[PDB]
Structure 1
């Protein structure tokens, strides 16, 4: 695995596209070499190159999604791929504010008649 993720991050978007085309073409010729009787050093190169494409594609996708998250951070209608991670049950449950809601009659009574602190002498 020789792509040096530190170097991928410094590259620009077009450079990533240009590099991805170079890697894919180089990998394609290495598939030919293995079939046509390649050397073990060539075969080990084939395994290595496959990891750069996975490494290279991850950075492009991660950066693109991160930019999208910033774009839709203030948006009213966020795409479902960018909403907070929950389960189906969690979405359906009432909000904590809704659960604790009380009527004005009960809210004012609890204000005027709270649970006192006391103790019994023995």
Structure 2
């Protein structure tokens, strides 16, 4: 557990890390869209979500 901490500090910032140093959550999670790819919002629904977003309202009775 000492040589792995040195390797994790060595591959810190590297685009390509060894397979054993990558997060092993499960085979289904590793093939999901990352936070960057799922937050991508196309230029059409960016304008639609800007001026047609549901507002906070209330009804008297």
Q: TM-score range by the shorter chain?
A: 0.7 to 0.9
Paired with 2:21 and 2:46, the residues of 1 have a C-alpha distance of 37
Instruction: Name the counterpart of 1:102.
Output: 41
| Offset at residue 100 of structure 1 (A) | 3.7
Matched, 1:116 2:58: no
What CA RMSD, in Å, does the superposition of the two structures yield over aligned residues? 1.5
After superposition, where does 1:1-122 map in structure 2 within 5 Å? 62-122=1-61
Runs of 5+ unmatched residues, structure 1: 1-61
| Offset at residue 107 of structure 1 (A) | 0.9
| Offset at residue 106 of structure 1 (A) | 1.4
Runs of 4+ in structure 1 displaced over 6 angstroms? none
Higher relative contact order (CA 8 A, sep 6+): 1
Superposition TM-score, scaled by structure 2 size:
0.80
Paired with 2:17 and 2:3, the residues of 1 have a C-alpha distance of 16
Count of residues in correspondence between the two structures: 61
Task: Flag the 1:121–1:114 CA change in 2: closer, same or farther, 3 A.
Answer: same
Paired with 2:43 and 2:50, the residues of 1 have a C-alpha distance of 10
Superposition TM-score, scaled by structure 1 size:
0.45
